[PDB]
Amino acid sequence: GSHMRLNGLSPQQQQQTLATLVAAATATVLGHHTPESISPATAFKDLGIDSLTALELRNTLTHNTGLDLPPTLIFDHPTPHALTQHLHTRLTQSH
Numbered sequence: 001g002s003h004m005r006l007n008g009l010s011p012q013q014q015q016q017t018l019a020t021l022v023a024a025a026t027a028t029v030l031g032h033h034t035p036e037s038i039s040p041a042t043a044f045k046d047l048g049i050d051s052l053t054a055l056e057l058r059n060t061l062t063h064n065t066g067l068d069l070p071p072t073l074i075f076d077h078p079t080p081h082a083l084t085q086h087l088h089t090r091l092t093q094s095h
């Protein structure tokens with residue numbers, strides 16, 4: 001797990017990856033929408049995320065990160081943006 005062997009990226013270079021991840025993640029749980037078109041400043045609320053699909057989103061981006069993530073993930077930081085930051089820290093600060 002953790003394809004992060006490409007480490008050495010600047011914050012935003014990782015963030016863009018992650019903003020694409022979480023978007024592709026959420027767009028998959030709901031089975032809709034081009035992930036590239038998922039706006040970071042928008043809330044998963046608006047994107048169509050409920051409580052059940054919240055965890056599925058986490059599940060997806062957790063499987064794509066290879067680390068372990070709290071079931072309160074989406075409960076605490078719901079946005080494509082906020083997860084981008086959290087997962088960024090999870091990848092750089094945590095190994």
Ligand SMILES: *P(=O)(O)OCC(C)(C)[C@@H](O)C(=O)NCCC(=O)NCCSC(=O)CCCCCCC
Nearest residue numbers: 044045046048049050051052053054074075076078
């Ligand atoms: P969930 O418990 O699985 O949601 C199903 C629910 C709330 C019982 C139904 O009423 C329903 O499908 N309506 C959803 C309305 C909402 O906007 N609620 C979404 C999640 S409720 C909640 O607060 C869970 C924590 C997630 C916080 C971010 C809100 C998406």
